[PDB]
């Protein structure tokens, strides 16, 4: 029981890291930094859990 619960916390921490890299390299972005482009429809898309 201890090892299974500890697995659940490990995969939660992994998903936290997968969010952190996106938020880190998103919020360091400045005006015309590198590789920015026109995208369209993202302001239309709102998926949320």
């Amino acid at each position: 029981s201890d090892r299974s619960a500890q697995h659940e916390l490990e995969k939660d921490l992994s998903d936290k890291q997968a969010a952190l890299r996106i938020d880190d390299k998103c919020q360091h972005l400045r005006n015309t930094s590198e590789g920015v482009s026109y995208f369209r429809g993202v302001e239309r898309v709102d998926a949320t859990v």
């Binding site: 969010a19 996106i22 972005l29 920015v36 026109y38 995208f39 993202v42 302001e43 898309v45 859990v49």
Partner: protein
């Protein structure tokens, strides 16, 4: 308009748990609509000039 709307699309690659809608989504869609409106009014006034 470049930097804000590619900020939106470069954000929206997120995984399942953190696929959400915070204030950043709402502020960014308001940003891109008002920058678009500024483009149309400056284009019209250039035409009248």
């Amino acid at each position: 308009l470049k930097v804000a709307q590619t900020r939106l699309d470069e954000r929206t690659r997120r995984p399942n748990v953190e696929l959400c809608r915070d204030m950043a989504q709402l502020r960014l869609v308001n940003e891109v609509y008002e920058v678009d409106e500024t483009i149309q009014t400056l284009q019209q006034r250039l035409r009248d000039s």
